[PDB]
Amino acid sequence: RYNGLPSMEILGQAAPGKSTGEAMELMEQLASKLPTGVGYDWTGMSYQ
Amino acid sequence: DGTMTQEDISDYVAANMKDAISRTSGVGDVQLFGSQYAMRIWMNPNEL
């Protein structure tokens, strides 16, 4: 669970010669195409 | 849109909004104007 709601943590990283912020933009785009009632957030290293 | 009553709205706020708002930056106490749903067993003493 994350912030009181059911969750699933997903770890990953940027491919060679790609910034982390650029890698995160794609995960946000892919997350927008998921089913109804599914959101997302960033935690840990990605939060700060 | 007349789909949700006063009671339906209060439950949605209680069960999806209140907790996250109550853990938000700089938020002290949080008062719900309404009540969360519970399973109500409305007993009948004649049938009992």
Side-chain angles (χ1 to χ4, degrees), chain A residues 3-5, chain B residues 15 20 23:
Chain A
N3 286 331
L5 299 175
Chain B
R23 293 188 284 269

Side-chain angles (χ1 to χ4, degrees), chain B residues 2-44:
Chain B
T3 52
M4 308 180 73
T5 66
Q6 179 268 125
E7 298 177 25
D8 286 307
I9 298 153
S10 286
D11 180 65
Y12 190 80
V13 173
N16 303 265
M17 307 186 72
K18 198 197 171 189
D19 288 1
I21 292 287
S22 72
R23 293 188 284 269
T24 304
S25 167
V27 172
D29 195 46
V30 174
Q31 183 69 49
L32 181 74
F33 296 123
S35 186
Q36 195 185 230
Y37 281 152
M39 185 63 51
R40 304 304 310 216
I41 313 305
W42 296 117
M43 298 184 297
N44 180 317

